[PDB]
Amino acid sequence: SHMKKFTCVQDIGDLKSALAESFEIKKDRFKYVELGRNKTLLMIFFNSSLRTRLSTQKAALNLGMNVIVLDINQGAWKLETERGVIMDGDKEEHLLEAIPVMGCYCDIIGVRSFARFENREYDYNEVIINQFIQHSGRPVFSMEAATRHPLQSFADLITIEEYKKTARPKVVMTWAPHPRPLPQAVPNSFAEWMNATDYEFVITHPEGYELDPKFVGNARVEYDQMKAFEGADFIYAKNWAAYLGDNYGQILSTDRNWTVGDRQMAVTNNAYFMHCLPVRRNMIVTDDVIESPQSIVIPEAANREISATVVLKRLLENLP
Amino acid sequence: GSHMKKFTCVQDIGDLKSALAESFEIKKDRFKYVELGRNKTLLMIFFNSSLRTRLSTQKAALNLGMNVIVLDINQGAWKLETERGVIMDGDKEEHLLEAIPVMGCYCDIIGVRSFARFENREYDYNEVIINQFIQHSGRPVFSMEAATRHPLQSFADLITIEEYKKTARPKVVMTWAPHPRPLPQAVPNSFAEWMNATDYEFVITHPEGYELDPKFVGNARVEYDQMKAFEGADFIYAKNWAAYLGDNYGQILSTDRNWTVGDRQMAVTNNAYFMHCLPVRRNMIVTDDVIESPQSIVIPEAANREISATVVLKRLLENLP
Amino acid sequence: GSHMKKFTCVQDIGDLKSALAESFEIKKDRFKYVELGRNKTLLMIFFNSSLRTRLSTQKAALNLGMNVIVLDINQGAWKLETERGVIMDGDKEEHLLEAIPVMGCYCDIIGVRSFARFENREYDYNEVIINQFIQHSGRPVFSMEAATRHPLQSFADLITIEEYKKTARPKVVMTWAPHPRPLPQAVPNSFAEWMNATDYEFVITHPEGYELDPKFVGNARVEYDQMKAFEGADFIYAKNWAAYLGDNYGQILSTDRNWTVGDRQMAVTNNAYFMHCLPVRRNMIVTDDVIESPQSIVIPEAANREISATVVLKRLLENLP
Numbered sequence: 001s002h003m004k005k006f007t008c009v010q011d012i013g014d015l016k017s018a019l020a021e022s023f024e025i026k027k028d029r030f031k032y033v034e035l036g037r038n039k040t041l042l043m044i045f046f047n048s049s050l051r052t053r054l055s056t057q058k059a060a061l062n063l064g065m066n067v068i069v070l071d072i073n074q075g076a077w078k079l080e081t082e083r084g085v086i087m088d089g090d091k092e093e094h095l096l097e098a099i100p101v102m103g104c105y106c107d108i109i110g111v112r113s114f115a116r117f118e119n120r121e122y123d124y125n126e127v128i129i130n131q132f133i134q135h136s137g138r139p140v141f142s143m144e145a146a147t148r149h150p151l152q153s154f155a156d157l158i159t160i161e162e163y164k165k166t167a168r169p170k171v172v173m174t175w176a177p178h179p180r181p182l183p184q185a186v187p188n189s190f191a192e193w194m195n196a197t198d199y200e201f202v203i204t205h206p207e208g209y210e211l212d213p214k215f216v217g218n219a220r221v222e223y224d225q226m227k228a229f230e231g232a233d234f235i236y237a238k239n240w241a242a243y244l245g246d247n248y249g250q251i252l253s254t255d256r257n258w259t260v261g262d263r264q265m266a267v268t269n270n271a272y273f274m275h276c277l278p279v280r281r282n283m284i285v286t287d288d289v290i291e292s293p294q295s296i297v298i299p300e301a302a303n304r305e306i307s308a309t310v311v312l313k314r315l316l317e318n319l320p
Numbered sequence: 321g322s323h324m325k326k327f328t329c330v331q332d333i334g335d336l337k338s339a340l341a342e343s344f345e346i347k348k349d350r351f352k353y354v355e356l357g358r359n360k361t362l363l364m365i366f367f368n369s370s371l372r373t374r375l376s377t378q379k380a381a382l383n384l385g386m387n388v389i390v391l392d393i394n395q396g397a398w399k400l401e402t403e404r405g406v407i408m409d410g411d412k413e414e415h416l417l418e419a420i421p422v423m424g425c426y427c428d429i430i431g432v433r434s435f436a437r438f439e440n441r442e443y444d445y446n447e448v449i450i451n452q453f454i455q456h457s458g459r460p461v462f463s464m465e466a467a468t469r470h471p472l473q474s475f476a477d478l479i480t481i482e483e484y485k486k487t488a489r490p491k492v493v494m495t496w497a498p499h500p501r502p503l504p505q506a507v508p509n510s511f512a513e514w515m516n517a518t519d520y521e522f523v524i525t526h527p528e529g530y531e532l533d534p535k536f537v538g539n540a541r542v543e544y545d546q547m548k549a550f551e552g553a554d555f556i557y558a559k560n561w562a563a564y565l566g567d568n569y570g571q572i573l574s575t576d577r578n579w580t581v582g583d584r585q586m587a588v589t590n591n592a593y594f595m596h597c598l599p600v601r602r603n604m605i606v607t608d609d610v611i612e613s614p615q616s617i618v619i620p621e622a623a624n625r626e627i628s629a630t631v632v633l634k635r636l637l638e639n640l641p
Numbered sequence: 642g643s644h645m646k647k648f649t650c651v652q653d654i655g656d657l658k659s660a661l662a663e664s665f666e667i668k669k670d671r672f673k674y675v676e677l678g679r680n681k682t683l684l685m686i687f688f689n690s691s692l693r694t695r696l697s698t699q700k701a702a703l704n705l706g707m708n709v710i711v712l713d714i715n716q717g718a719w720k721l722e723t724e725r726g727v728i729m730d731g732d733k734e735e736h737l738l739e740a741i742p743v744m745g746c747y748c749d750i751i752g753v754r755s756f757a758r759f760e761n762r763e764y765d766y767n768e769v770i771i772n773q774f775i776q777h778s779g780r781p782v783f784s785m786e787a788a789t790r791h792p793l794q795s796f797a798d799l800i801t802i803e804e805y806k807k808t809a810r811p812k813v814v815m816t817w818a819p820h821p822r823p824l825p826q827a828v829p830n831s832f833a834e835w836m837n838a839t840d841y842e843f844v845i846t847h848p849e850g851y852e853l854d855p856k857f858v859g860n861a862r863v864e865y866d867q868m869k870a871f872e873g874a875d876f877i878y879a880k881n882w883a884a885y886l887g888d889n890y891g892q893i894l895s896t897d898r899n900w901t902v903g904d905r906q907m908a909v910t911n912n913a914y915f916m917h918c919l920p921v922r923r924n925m926i927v928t929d930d931v932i933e934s935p936q937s938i939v940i941p942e943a944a945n946r947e948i949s950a951t952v953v954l955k956r957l958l959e960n961l962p
């Protein structure tokens with residue numbers, strides 16, 4: 001296991017052993033508290049965060065690491081992302097100096113940088129997250145980039161294994177309405193990871209909301225929500241803005257009929273309800289559904305500490 | 321008392337005597353229990369500003385060798401929707417109902433600061449928010465100032481009065497003072513609550529209309545004449561608060577600068593010490609001269625916030641499963 | 642020199658030789674003194690933005706096994722009233738006079754960053770604020786950049802020049818450069834102050850009207866012809882600063898892009914290295930090509946900020962009561 005970064009499911013290697021370490025740590029949280037002694041983790045945020053912000057610090061502490069959270073934009077200087085521009089305006093520092101500089105004071109870097117929805121190529125080529133990998137001079141892990149969110153998916157995996165009633169459950173990812181255009185990072189990431197399992201994976205969303213093929217893989221895509229839900233064992237709801245052609249980053253619908261309510265859950269095999277959070281109640285899911293005992297939203301969130309501890313541990317183990 | 325499950329009111333601290341004992345024990349030997357909280361994580365959550373609580377609590381946690389995570393919800397996280405059963409099709413991204421449980425997932429103890437909102441007296445006085453953390457965080461919760469109390473502060477105030485008192489049962493007078501904005505009655509309520517728990521001679525003095533909730537006032541003497549209350553006092557605890565009674569909940573009834581604690585009033589005291597929880601608006605709450613006088617123990621007071629916090633944190637730790 | 646009570650100017654570091662010695666000692670063995678600062682708490686206070694100082698200082702403190710509390714006053718705390726004897730019946734909730742002492746209550750060492758306000762030259766140059774922390778914090782105070790100096794930076798600059806110099810006494814040229822906003826002369830002042838303390842050949846080059854305070858310029862050669870100053874330089878330290886003399890204090894006299902350090906000027910140097918404290922506005926202060934060239938040691942420089950901080954912090958620790 002030579003983890004040099006953590007941005008996609010490939011980086012975690014064999015899911016079996018990965019899950020093994022996961023539950024090992026769930027059972028004995030501070031087992032490796034000495035592993036990261038005198039090792040410093042730098043968490044950088046370009047966007048808001050409750051779970052990632054908190055869960056990652058806890059994870060680092062579980063490994064006895066030093067933690068430095070940097071909310072660039074608030075305490076530091078707004079960065080100029082484009083190269084070859086005359087910085088005679090708004091920005092004081094260029095990303096080109098910033099990244100290297102930040103790498104100077106830590107051993108591992110965590111970066112959260114939501115898709116900007118300004119240019120699909122820029123977003124999907126994951127320019128920013130890649131520059132940290134290229135010039136930080138340190139191992140970099142994603143706290144959600146423009147197109148993936150491995151730390152989240154990994155946790156989702158852990159919780160499904162943790163709660164599944166059979167070896168290969170039917171896991172259905174469903175779109176839901178949201179008032180703002182959200183990245184497809186979570187959906188992309190979830191699919192990517194589910195496709196890596198032997199689960200029966202199905203993706204259901206409205207017309208026009210198809211995700212990038214490379215992520216969809218060969219998962220069944222059902223345009224009829226009620227159909228996809230039939231006999232599901234797990235429902236993973238999440239909204240995302242359009243991706244195809246002329247609608248990149250746009251809201252094509254706010255059809256409240258997709259709001260995961262009791263109507264749809266009923267058709268499932270008494271499936272559990274999952275969501276990465278934050279969640280807008282009575283938009284993505286009904287108060288009753290999320291409050292029902294089938295909702296494992298919290299246990300899920302909880303596992304974020306685990307996924308992070310494992311990834312952090314791996315990265316540490318491979319530090320020079 | 322040694323079964324601390326939370327810390328929101330004076331009842332939670334148990335026997336004042338032993339509590340004060342631990343306090344001075346730690347004042348003397350600050351890191352005596354530095355190993356107690358090893359690998360134990362404290363989560364401090366702020367919904368409002370803070371200098372003293374923000375700083376003093378982190379130091380306290382470190383004194384116990386704990387891990388500290390300060391979260392300024394609203395800045396780094398997502399604004400929460402507090403009301404239940406609403407359609408979150410607007411401003412907010414996350415609901416308090418998910419937020420609290422989630423936060424509990426990553427720590428062992430939680431500290432919350434949530435000022436009274438002055439929107440609905442019942443909501444504030446039923447301490448809905450602070451209680452939901454207690455109900456759904458799944459962790460021991462301590463108040464960094466709720467809507468109606470501020471135990472961490474009062475406890476420190478107690479420690480400092482004991483620390484400086486010249487006699488066994490001093491006359492401690494709490495006095496209202498003018499302020500340009502409507503402030504919570506959390507500090508006053510809390511102070512009374514704690515003073516009433518002592519054998520001190522406690523007196524509360526404020527303008528007409530500013531009476532505090534009876535359950536807090538207890539049976540403390542209420543003097544509407546400031547100069548009278550001040551007579552022969554040993555300690556003066558000044559603090560402003562907005563009206564509470566009936567139609568004026570959360571409102572400024574007066575900004576009478578005559579109540580500003582100046583030399584005029586101190587003179588009538590028994591050379592009393594001056595106290596205030598801070599922040600303090602100079603020449604509004606108290607005169608520059610008074611606060612700068614040697615009778616002002618404002619800082620030593622503030623300093624004790626580290627102590628009160630260390631003790632509470634220690635107790636909470638000791639009772640962690 | 643070995644009894645550090647504060648760190649605001651080059652005098653505080655003592656003998657440069659031994660100072661540099663410790664510097665490289667730590668560069669080689671980063672956590673050598675990780676036990677030195679155990680159970681010692683550092684409080685970093687920011688009144689202005691910061692990437693390098695904010696990060697480098699926390700790392701430094703960790704290298705010494707210290708506790709770190711970063712406080713972004715203004716965001717999490719209460720805006721302070723700086724002027725004394727005012728009636729705080731407005732905007733501010735807390736006065737600097739209470740704030741400083743209070744903050745000192747919870748730490749062992751304090752780091753403060755407070756940019757020059759450019760409102761009154763005397764106020765800025767008398768370094769009123771940074772001095773009040775020294776006067777009333779009750780703790781050793783070190784500058785994270787005050788109104789007129791930035792020792793932590795200069796010390797690092799020194800370390801990197803020694804680290805890269807090709808001869809015993811290189812020609813180090815500090816050059817002004819255009820900037821759209823009026824910047825403090827703290828970095829330039831500080832750089833000169835430290836260079837003047839070395840046996841290097843030091844030259845300062847800037848446009849007419851931008852002369853720095855004499856006490857800082859010392860007896861360094863001042864060349865108004867940029868191209869002349871650059872001739873055969875071994876190190877180029879670029880940095881913008883607003884006017885200082887008489888009627889133009891804190892003002893932009895020029896934005897002459899001819900001073901932008903580009904290849905044109907570097908060519909005339911002795912293949913000199915390029916330095917800058919950062920942040921840097923590309924194609925304003927320096928050309929993309931210049932800063933990206935291999936002669937640019939901008940990052941190695943920034944990196945040394947961790948070292949300068951670790952040394953200063955170590956010294957301060959060693960002299961704690």
Ligand SMILES: CCC[C@H](NC(C)=O)C(=O)O
Nearest residue numbers: 182183185186277278413
């Ligand atoms: C972790 C989720 C972050 C974000 N959600 C929102 C609502 O901003 C997203 O969809 O990527």
Ligand SMILES: CCC[C@H](NC(C)=O)C(=O)O
Nearest residue numbers: 503504506507598599734
């Ligand atoms: C610690 C005091 C906090 C607050 N003060 C202000 C000014 O908001 C209050 O009166 O509750």
Ligand SMILES: CCC[C@H](NC(C)=O)C(=O)O
Nearest residue numbers: 092824825828918919920
């Ligand atoms: C490192 C200090 C940077 C600062 N510059 C700005 C942009 O305010 C200054 O000139 O002091």
